[PDB]
Amino acid sequence: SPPPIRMGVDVPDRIAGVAYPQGTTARRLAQIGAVVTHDGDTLTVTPPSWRPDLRQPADLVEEVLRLEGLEVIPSVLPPAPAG
Amino acid sequence: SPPPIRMGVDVPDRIAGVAYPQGTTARRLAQIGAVVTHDGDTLTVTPPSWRPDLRQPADLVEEVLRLEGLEVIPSVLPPAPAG
Ligand SMILES: [Mg+2]
Ligand SMILES: [Mg+2]
């Protein structure tokens, strides 16, 4: 088993800009073969042995975003300062 | 006496972008001769008879801002819109 990863339950929601339904992050991370335990608002994710690419929370964010479909991510313009 | 004017207690703070000390708006408006009464977070300002120019909250904002001095207003570039 690779080392466990600690990540907030709403981290994929923040990076995607989408409010995913309840339990979406835990369910998708369990589908790809990882074991997820709940510690309040923080998830402890241990990726499966066949997924050594999952080392940081960003690696887990890509798993949720790609399985939920990148088409659900809205289109908002960033707040760029005066150049 | 001209009709009374209602505006928020922090309206001059918002228009100026400066967090004035508490009681600044009420002190300055009474200083120019207006009757100021308190109702929660809304000020009822009755300008004096020699100030018919004070008719709207914007007129009251000018009095607080000019007496406190426009030098305290910081230089904050607004975010660049997607032009
Ligand atoms: Mg990846
Ligand atoms: Mg004026």
Side-chain angles (χ1 to χ4, degrees), chain B residues 51 53-54 59 62-63:
Chain B
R51 297 298 303 271
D53 49 318
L54 307 179
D59 301 319
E62 185 182 65
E63 301 300 311

Side-chain angles (χ1 to χ4, degrees), chain B residues 61-82:
Chain B
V61 173
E62 185 182 65
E63 301 300 311
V64 180
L65 268 55
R66 73 183 179 92
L67 289 183
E68 290 294 309
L70 299 185
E71 319 83 83
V72 307
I73 300 179
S75 182
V76 176
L77 257 180

Side-chain angles (χ1 to χ4, degrees), chain A residues 56-82:
Chain A
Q56 301 196 24
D59 293 308
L60 308 177
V61 170
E62 187 186 58
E63 297 297 299
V64 177
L65 269 56
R66 76 186 182 94
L67 290 184
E68 289 290 308
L70 300 184
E71 63 277 358
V72 310
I73 296 176
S75 179
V76 300
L77 288 150

Side-chain angles (χ1 to χ4, degrees), chain A residues 6-36:
Chain A
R6 289 180 52 88
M7 182 189 65
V9 67
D10 64 332
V11 173
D13 301 61
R14 294 176 177 177
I15 296 182
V18 187
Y20 294 109
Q22 180 72 17
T24 300
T25 295
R27 190 186 74 89
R28 293 297 191 174
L29 293 175
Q31 276 183 324
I32 53 97
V35 39
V36 184

